[PDB]
Each structure stands twice: as C-alpha cells, then as structure tokens.
Design a protein around this nucleic acid. Structure first.
Length: 50
RNA sequence: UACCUGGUUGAUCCUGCCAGUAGCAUAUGCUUGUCUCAAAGAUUAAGCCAUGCAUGUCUAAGUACGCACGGCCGGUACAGU
C-alpha cells in the first residue's frame, strides 16, 4: 500500500488568515533518491575491483 | 680620553683610610611653553575581595506538524524564512 494519503493532517484556525492544514515530512519512505544513493554505493565497489 | 684632588706635621718623605668626581635606577623636593615616541600594585601581604564584563557555534548538504511570520492551492516524503 501507499503510505501517503493515510498520513494524519492537523487543521489550523485563527481570526486573521484563511484556514490551513499541516502534516510532517515522512522519515523512512524509500523514494527514488534513496535507491539512487544505493546504486552508486555498489558502483564504487566495482570501480575499486577493476 | 689607558687621568686624579682636599685631610695626620713646627716643616719633610711614606703607609693607609676617610671626603670629593662621572654614569646607572627606585623614592622625593622645587620648577614647566610647543612637538614625536612610551615604562607604569614586581620589592611589603602567592594578603582579602562589593559590582559589571572576560567562550561560544549553522550550511545547497543530521532531526522543522512553533498560527511565529507567509504564497494563490495543492503536501505529489515535503515550499519558504
């Protein structure tokens, strides 16, 4: 399942500005950037053996 | 700049020390217009200390749900300060 969309949201209300909602940055999500760092980590091992 | 002078006797020649003469660095007295440098609670007590200051620190790159401030609307991890 997708871990996004199920994340809890916090509503903001005050007399001045418009309503808003907040949610946190997610800390173990395995995005494409995490996978890209894992690929270079093993490309450096191959270069040293050559 | 490798230098001496007064003082023992009625007078002389010596020994020998006292006093004078020049510099240096601590205190102290009288006196003082301009201008460039600049030592300064070591000496006695490593004695006793009111008050203030004398050591802090963030980048594109460890952790941002602070309505704290904010955008054109939306969290697509999640904007931005």
């Amino acid at each position: 399942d997708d871990v996004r969309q199920y994340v809890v949201r916090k509503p903001l209300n005050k007399e001045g500005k418009k309503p808003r909602t907040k949610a946190p940055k997610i800390q173990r999500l395995v995005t494409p950037r995490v996978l890209q760092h894992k690929r270079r980590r093993i490309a450096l091992k191959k270069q040293r053996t050559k």
